[PDB]
Paper text:
Here we show that Psb29 in Synechocystis 6803, like THF1 in Arabidopsis, is important for normal accumulation of the FtsH heterocomplex involved in PSII repair. To gain further insights into Psb29, we have determined the crystal structure of Psb29 encoded by Thermosynechococcus elongatus, a thermophilic cyanobacterium widely used to study structural aspects of PSII assembly and repair. Each Psb29 subunit consists of 9 alpha helices. A search using PDBeFOLD found no known structures with greater than 70% similarity, indicating that the specific fold is novel.
For preparations in the presence of protease inhibitor, the only crystals obtained were of needle morphology in P6322, which diffracted very weakly. The P6322 form was soaked overnight in 1 mM 4-(Chloromercuri)benzensulfonic acid sodium salt (Jena Bioscience), but this was not used for phase determination. The B-P21,I222 and P6322 crystal forms were solved by molecular replacement with Phaser using the A-P21 structure as a model. The most complete structure consisting of residues 4 to 206 of the predicted 222 residues of Psb29 was obtained from P6322 needle-shaped crystals containing seven copies of Psb29 in the asymmetric unit, which form a continuous cylindrical shell of protein in the crystal, with the C-terminus of the protein forming a helix extending from the compact protein fold into the middle of the cylindrical protein shell. A striking feature of Psb29 is the presence of a long alpha helix at the C-terminus extending from the globular protein domain. The first 3 and last 16 residues could not be identified in the most complete crystal structure, possibly because of structural flexibility or because of some proteolytic degradation. In the B-P21 crystal form, the new carboxy terminus at residue Ala189 is clearly visible in the electron density. It is likely that proteolytic cleavage of the C-terminal helix allows more compact higher resolution crystal lattices to form, as there is insufficient space in these lattices to accommodate the C-terminal helix observed in the P6322 crystal form.
Numbering used by the authors: 4 to 206
Write the structure that this text describes.
Amino acid sequence: PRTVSDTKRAFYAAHTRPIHSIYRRFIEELLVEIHLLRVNVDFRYSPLFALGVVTAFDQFMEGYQPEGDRDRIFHALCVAEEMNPQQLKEDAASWQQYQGRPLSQILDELNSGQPSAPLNSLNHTGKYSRLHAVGLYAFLQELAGEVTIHLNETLDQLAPVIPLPIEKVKRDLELYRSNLDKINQARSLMKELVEQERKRRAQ
Ligand SMILES: [Hg+2]
């Protein structure tokens, strides 16, 4: 068994540099949430989990500086969680084969009993997480027809063909989009205030 302090020690090991605190509170939450996930007995690694982690990281790290470190933090935190930094980016990028597919055909591939990978991962998720809802959000994003706009209307269509707790998927995605709105509002506040530090020190 491993400990939150041990997993944190692992991140503070490979990442000995400062953590650049605007997105810090999210990194700590992502560190502990993933730890509490994999240490659970029913957790199963899946490309749906991989898509959700990479989607949550890329969108929540909007404008991370310096840019060269955002991929190194991704590299260090993965092994810190005993994950694979390359296997996660491969699984997350593997969903691109569904770009432009209609939602009707996606439902057909699930209803046939033989869904292809990584779409097959919707059944073998294992222990549910908020990150699994984010992975579904990123998958439904790239589909054809702007299926994300009326998200609840889409999730109710998936409910009978998916084993996921749709009502918990609705909630965690609304919590996800509300949090993403706060960081971009804060990141835009940095751009509004970093010019006041750059255009007034040289004024
Ligand atoms: Hg990671």
